[PDB]
Scaffold this active site. Structure first.
Site, PDB file in Angstrom:
ATOM      1  N   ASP A 199      21.955 -28.883 -49.002  1.00 31.31           N
ATOM      2  CA  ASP A 199      20.857 -29.243 -48.680  1.00 31.31           C
ATOM      3  C   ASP A 199      20.069 -30.335 -47.951  1.00 31.31           C
ATOM      4  O   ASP A 199      20.786 -30.911 -47.448  1.00 31.31           O
ATOM      5  CB  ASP A 199      20.408 -30.115 -50.751  1.00 31.31           C
ATOM      6  CG  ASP A 199      19.044 -30.356 -50.544  1.00 31.31           C
ATOM      7  OD1 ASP A 199      17.600 -29.727 -51.250  1.00 31.31           O
ATOM      8  OD2 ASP A 199      18.846 -31.839 -50.828  1.00 31.31           O
ATOM      9  N   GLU A 259      39.954 -25.766 -42.980  1.00 34.30           N
ATOM     10  CA  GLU A 259      40.808 -25.896 -43.304  1.00 34.30           C
ATOM     11  C   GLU A 259      40.648 -25.171 -44.779  1.00 34.30           C
ATOM     12  O   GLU A 259      42.076 -25.396 -44.979  1.00 34.30           O
ATOM     13  CB  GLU A 259      40.695 -27.306 -43.768  1.00 34.30           C
ATOM     14  CG  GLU A 259      41.379 -28.835 -42.985  1.00 34.30           C
ATOM     15  CD  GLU A 259      40.872 -30.103 -43.158  1.00 34.30           C
ATOM     16  OE1 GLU A 259      41.990 -30.132 -44.317  1.00 34.30           O
ATOM     17  OE2 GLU A 259      40.348 -30.658 -43.101  1.00 34.30           O
TER      18      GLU A 259
END
Ligand SMILES: OC[C@H]1O[C@@H](O)[C@H](O)[C@@H](O)[C@@H]1O
Ligand SMILES: [Mg+2]
Length: 535
Positions: A199, A259
């Protein structure tokens, strides 16, 4: 397939208005889970869920009070885990909103921060002394009305909120606050989510010097991300958002995503120069994976306009990657916003063929696949706070948030009780059940188009080259390896004929479109798309 996101088609679900399985009139997570087979049948690659986190619902989920839990009206965290498992079993990726720019004022971080100037979370939000006359520190405005600053008596200071007074902005200049947000995101990554919609991604940093924005000069165009009736549009937004420090934070966020191989991010850009901001934010391979802008979420929609957007984008960073959307929970439904003066059945079909043929990823909004028009929500049913500040010049966003029509029956099968926003009567005639087995319905046009897109590598991530098919047609080639397709679209209600600018080897039928080709002459009836294999 770790690069699925770079060209993938995502279906945006607005949980409050998808399916109420519980019976309180509000859509919930188990309702989504029940309908994941339907979503998979669209031939989309994944979903993006608007917020379902604990929230007072003052901005209907975008005011978050617990980042690591599900609001009780949507169900539980186990319901989410079940949704995720079922989506994966159907081959769907699951992305979720992350609302890290601000919290609810009921978030414990803010409850702590606001108590005084000296507590451990004092600097986690954006606090500033009044001017000597007691007024806000500068001229920044809330998008939802009034000053972006609200006075708190406990600290004798103002706090910043780009949105509601109950949505205090997080201070990204404070390293521990940034890390806390990354840790919140990691919580969801550890649960196995496939990525995030970020957002207001360019809003995270404000100017620490709190400088006043300059006015927009008379005669200049207003921002694409707010209605012209809103005073927010009278400023150029230079100090309140899109600050250089955010680029470094995006690198930290990308490092987190890296990751978890196969995960992605799509940022929501709200900027005076949104294509430029999207290109900057998604370049370099070290920041956002993709982002969407309001360029295709506003009023212009002609072939000439679309060419202009493409031409502008093709001058920017070559390593940028866009996500294109023509509808979402913040704007008038595309069938109305773009198609109000066009055939209501035929126009959405060609519009979607265009959307699905642009070079980029795609967001498709719930109900857009049904060709749903904007709802007319009466004054007494308005819920969105943004619908109660500029009425009637701007009526808020409820018109695109009315419940999904699963059937033509009571409440469209959405709920056993009166829903939180009224079911639009017109939507019942366009319900999923009414379109399911109608090969001529927009639902089935979408299914066919996305099956077609999947079958052509050029339409996943091929290069795009505009070609000259005249002013009133949109035409380009898409190329990947040995495959070059020519794509030509008549977005108008009148037949068009053009000479083809490239040599065509064969025609590629799809979705009952009806263009005629006689050698180099292509005739496109009203609202038709044409795809061809280039020689
Ligand atoms: O978070 C505040 C705003 O953020 C953006 C979302 O897309 C809007 O629905 C919301 O009102
Ligand atoms: Mg419910």
């Amino acid at each position: 397939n770790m690069m699925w996101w770079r060209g993938g088609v995502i279906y945006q679900i607005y949980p409050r208005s998808f399916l109420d399985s519980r019976g309180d009139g509000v859509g919930d997570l188990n309702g989504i889970t029940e309908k994941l087979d339907y979503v998979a049948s669209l031939n989309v690659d994944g979903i993006w869920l608007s917020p379902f986190f604990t929230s007072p619902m003052l901005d209907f989920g975008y005011d978050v009070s617990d980042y690591r839990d599900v609001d009780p009206m949507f169900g539980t965290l186990e319901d989410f885990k079940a949704l995720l498992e079922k989506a994966h079993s159907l081959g769907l990726k699951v992305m979720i909103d992350q609302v890290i720019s601000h919290t609810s004022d009921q978030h414990p971080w803010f409850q702590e921060s606001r108590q005084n100037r000296t507590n451990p979370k004092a600097d986690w939000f954006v606090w500033a002394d009044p001017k000597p006359d007691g007024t806000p520190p500068n001229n920044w405005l809330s998008i939802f009305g009034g000053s972006a600053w609200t006075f708190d008596s406990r600290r004798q200071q103002y706090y910043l909120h780009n949105f509601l007074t109950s949505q205090p902005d997080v201070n990204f200049h404070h390293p521990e606050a940034r890390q806390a947000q990354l840790d919140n995101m990691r919580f969801w990554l550890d649960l196995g989510v496939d990525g995030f919609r970020l957002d207001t991604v360019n809003f995270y940093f404000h100017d620490a010097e709190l400088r006043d924005n300059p006015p927009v000069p008379k005669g200049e165009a207003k921002t694409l991300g707010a209605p012209e009736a809103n005073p927010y549009t009278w400023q150029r937004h230079v100090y309140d958002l899109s600050r250089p420090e955010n680029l470094d934070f995006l690198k930290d966020l990308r490092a987190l995503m890296d990751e978890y191989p196969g995960t992605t991010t799509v940022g929501e850009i709200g900027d005076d120069n949104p294509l430029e901001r999207m290109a900057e934010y998604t370049a370099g391979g070290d920041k956002l994976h993709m982002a969407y802008t309001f360029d295709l979420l506003n009023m212009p929609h002609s072939a000439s306009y679309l060419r202009e957007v493409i031409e502008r984008f093709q001058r920017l960073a070559g390593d940028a990657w866009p996500c294109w959307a023509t509808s979402n929970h913040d704007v008038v439904r595309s069938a109305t916003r773009w198609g109000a003066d066009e055939d209501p059945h035929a126009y959405p079909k060609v519009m979607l063929a265009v959307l699905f043929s642009l070079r980029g990823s795609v967001c498709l909004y719930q109900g857009e696949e049904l060709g749903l028009p904007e709802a007319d929500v009466p004054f007494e049913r308005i819920q969105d706070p943004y619908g109660k500040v500029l009425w009637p010049e701007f009526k808020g966003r409820d018109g695109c948030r009315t419940p999904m029509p699963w059937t033509d029956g009571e409440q469209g099968g959405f709920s056993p009780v009166e829903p939180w926003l009224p079911m639009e009567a017109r939507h019942l005639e366009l319900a999923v059940s009414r379109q399911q087995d109608d090969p001529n319905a927009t639902l089935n046009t979408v299914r066919a188009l996305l099956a077609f897109r999947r079958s052509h590598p050029a339409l996943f991530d091929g290069d795009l080259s505009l070609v000259d098919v005249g002013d009133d047609l949109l035409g380009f080639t898409r190329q990947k390896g040995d495959e070059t397709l020519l794509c030509v679209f008549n977005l108008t209600g009148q037949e068009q004929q053009t000479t083809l600018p490239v040599e065509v080897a064969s025609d590629l039928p799809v979705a009952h479109f009806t263009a005629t080709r006689d050698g180099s002459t292509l005739t496109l009836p009203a609202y038709q798309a044409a795809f061809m294999q280039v020689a």
